[PDB]
Amino acid sequence: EESRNTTVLDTTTTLQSSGFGRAFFGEAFNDLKTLMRRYQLYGQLLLSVTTDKDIDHCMFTFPCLPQGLALDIGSAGSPHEIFNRCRDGIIPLIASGYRFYRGDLRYKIVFPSNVNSNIWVQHRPDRRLEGWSAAKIVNCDAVSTGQGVYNHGYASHIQITRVNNVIELEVPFYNATCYNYLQAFNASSAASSYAVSLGEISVGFQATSDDIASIVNKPVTIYYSIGDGMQFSQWVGYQPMMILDQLPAPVV
Amino acid sequence: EESRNTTVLDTTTTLQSSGFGRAFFGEAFNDLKTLMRRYQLYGQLLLSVTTDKDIDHCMFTFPCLPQGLALDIGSAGSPHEIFNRCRDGIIPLIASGYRFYRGDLRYKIVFPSNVNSNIWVQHRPDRRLEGWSAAKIVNCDAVSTGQGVYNHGYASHIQITRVNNVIELEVPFYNATCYNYLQAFNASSAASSYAVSLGEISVGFQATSDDIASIVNKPVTIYYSIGDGMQFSQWVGYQPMMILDQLPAPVV
Amino acid sequence: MDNPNPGPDGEGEVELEKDSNVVLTTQRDPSTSIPAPVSVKWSRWTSNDVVDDYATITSRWYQIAEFVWSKDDPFDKELARLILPRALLSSIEANSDAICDVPNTIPFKVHAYWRGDMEVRVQINSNKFQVGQLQATWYYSDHENLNISSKRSVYGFSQMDHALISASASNEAKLVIPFKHVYPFLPTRIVPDWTTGILDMGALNIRVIAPLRMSATGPTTCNVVVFIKLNNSEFTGTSSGKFYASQIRA
Amino acid sequence: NPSYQQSPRHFVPTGMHSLALGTNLVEPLHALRLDAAGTTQHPVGCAPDEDMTVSSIASRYGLIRRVQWKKDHAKGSLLLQLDADPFVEQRIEGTNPISLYWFAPVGVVSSMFMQWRGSLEYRFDIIASQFHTGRLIVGYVPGLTASLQLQMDYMKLKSSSYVVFDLQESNSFTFEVPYVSYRPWWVRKYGGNYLPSSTDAPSTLFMYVQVPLIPMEAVSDTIDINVYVRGGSSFEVCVPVQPSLGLNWNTDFILRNDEEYRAKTGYAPYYAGVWHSFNNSNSLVFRWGSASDQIAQWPTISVPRGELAFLRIKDGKQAAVGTQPWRTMVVWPSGHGYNIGIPTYNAERARQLAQHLYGGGSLTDEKAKQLFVPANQQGPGKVSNGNPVWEVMRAPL
């Protein structure tokens, strides 16, 4: 068995416990979950209007999942260096170790400062994620379905940029499942598609098209952390890693 | 021995204690450490974009150490009069008296007001300081390593300039050392390099290059104080001083 | 403590392991590994329908798989990746006969939904002078993880709990696999909400670790057989077997 | 309605709750949950099997190594000398420029922390028949610099702490690596992509064949040996920093070579457009936006004197498309302190224009304006695909 230990061959004298730095730094670290609650970058984008968006329109959408979005290096023309360089990040890295999770997520989106416009945010649990592809931010365009617009019944909240340009969301767990998949999701069962993301967050400005131009190419960082209630389940060993300092230099 | 007193030759009648001004000014001063907690200027700069910085990029970096950064008079073309004139400052001056310290630091950075942009701040304990040279503010440029960009695991915080343009940081002590060097640090042991600065703070705007131009040559003051938990250790006598009012006049 | 006294009977004690009418045994002590704590029954939450285990027949052991393991097999070499609930049926279908033919598997022909823990024994008759080793590793919902192909290696599975089988000891590898899945139930057939990946739970898999080694004139190969008890199960969703369809060939 | 004449409180606003904090700290939020006090609940059948915990992970062996151990090995012969750090490696034969690596779980979890300390453990599994017999040291030398990493033998190794083992009946055991350093903790071996501040391991493990294997003729001379790392019971980490590792999920990377040329960041996608300050919009110029003065800005080409250069995209598909895709361009200063990119019909018009501007001729000049592409050509005004690379077509002037 994996954890069996046939025969210890101790040489060590007892070593004093640090209590995980509690002895020194005054704080324990053994509880990985509390570390999990520190926020992490979740995504990044420049706003990019396409159609003359109506106020109804969501500016963009994304699946809301612990695993982290499929990593975005960005284009060769426009690398997102932080993923290009600072690969992945902690929370997904630990997510690598488990096959299931149940619980919530925090986000705390940061809007560009320069704009004043009021900002709404839908949550749509209804949406199924579909394939690990498109586990990512998406810029909605011309309205067709109700997907591209603000929607009624879905829970939502509206930050006022003029008051403040950073919303602090909390995403409830809502699935008719025991608990969701945690590794990268290839899909299979049509039902299985519902069984991953907590749902689908979406964001839209109330700005009219005449004003919307100011908002173009503005940065929008997103963060997240597991929101206390989160619970990973089944252990799984790690997939192979890629060393970061081993990454190539930009080269002169 | 230094503190020995072979033979007192008192003439003095007993003089009433002021209790260090407690008797008059209503407050004691004997406790130097509380004085230490008053804030001091720690650095100063004008922001200076080089490369068309990506949002990932730290705008600049600096070692975080009690001793104070290596003093910056500034260029002959552009003296920073406060160091050119008001040499050093209190906290480093007292730091002169000890060979070790252990504890924390407060900072309270002040950003330029005119900009609206949101501002992030990494802490990187990982970085070793290297030589007393470059114990100073540094403007990071083209990304090569992950040094020049925002990073995941490092603790960080984001002020919103539009809400407020002054962050109020607290830097934890994190070293695998008993306690760090306190005088100017020439380095020696490669390990010794880790044994000084609490780490390395870094700051980056989320502004895109199109907007970043507004931020050019904007002042950024920095402050600091020892954060209560700080503890100096071994006594050391002072190195020779330079009198301030003795400093030369600008001359007409 | 020693003093062997081999008899006509042989010598060593033999463990039993009765279930239903099936009974099977080993000389060696099983190398158990249990991925998870035992499952709660969960019928409470999702079935008005009559719900029943058929332990009298479901609990019988049955030979889902068997194979040679020659020395020729390279170090990190899978010998099998058994999606389990599927392979119990897929194997019978591989025998080219109906699911109804085997007493173990008839209810699936009828019931739509199913839940329940599995048991897997992996017996072997490696000769003592033969040397090698196989790890066995259950992996939930393996199919759902697209990156699994990367992980699917001994270094990977080694990190999670796993049974071991020395060729030398010809050790048996017992293996509890309590039910866990995103949904509480596995359909036995195509279902309005899903079809694909029917009756999957992920897969057991047996990457070779140490390849057989021997004197060149020694017994070149080895054999392995796998049985699967299906204990604390529950069936539900009564239906005509006509609705039932053959498992994907895999 | 009494007046409340008493003095108002006097705070300091800040825009955001702390990020790094994550413990004894209520953290206010705008829950999208309907109930004011609702919380995720775990059904007894959905109960969290796993108490995620540093030790909980660290206490798991991962295979890390596969020594072959032939009969013929000399009694002095080494088998391996991996370092006494959690960050033990196992390279995969990834053909990718970024080769992947297996890690023991303990190494992975260690990677998230600047510092670590305590004992490790190496279970050894000598996959061997009982008839095989042998003996081998698995010593531990504290404080080896790499120069001293060599010079080793089992015998010098014996000078430091070590453990002999006798393969006969039981065919496996578990060595337990000591933690021995001047430092109470120990800095991470690697770090985020940042080579300095990547201190090496305190000490190094060794394993020599103390007594050469003596197999029976009826069994194989070679014997597979496997090495399993695992965090020791004493093992622990402390300070959380950027993990030095990345998932294999997306082993993709982009070098920032400067040789390729393209629009300044935040100025893409760009489209051929018009701009009143430029030829009174009578000629096309790239715009990253529609609102006035959203001209795409461009990095300054370094043209050595006596020459000229003009852009030509390496991909026509990514080119912004007016009446035609704009595969050719000449970047010139706006005169407003930045470099506009001017679409051209072809590499030649761009060339002639370069002959002009690098000839010191002005944009205002007819020679230029004739080469300027007229506003009517804007057509659809399609944006460039992202920020496509532009080949720099240098020519002597």
TrEMBL record, chains A, B:
| Localization terms from the record | Virion
- Signal peptide positions on this chain: none
In terms of superkingdom, the source organism counts as: Viruses
- What is the protein name for this chain? Genome polyprotein
Query: What is the species of this protein?
Result: Deformed wing virus
From the broadest rank down, the organism's phylogenetic lineage runs: Viruses, Riboviria, Orthornavirae, Pisuviricota, Pisoniviricetes
Automatic annotation (TrEMBL), chain C:
User: What subcellular locations does the record give?
Assistant: Virion
Q: Give the span(s) annotated as Disordered.
A: 1-15
For this entry, the protein name equals Genome polyprotein
Automatic annotation (TrEMBL), chain D:
Q: Where does the UniProt annotation locate this protein? A: Virion
Q: What is this protein called?
A: Genome polyprotein
Classification lineage: Viruses, Riboviria, Orthornavirae, Pisuviricota, Pisoniviricetes
Q: Which organism is it from?
A: Deformed wing virus
Residue span relative to the full protein: 487 to 883 of 2893
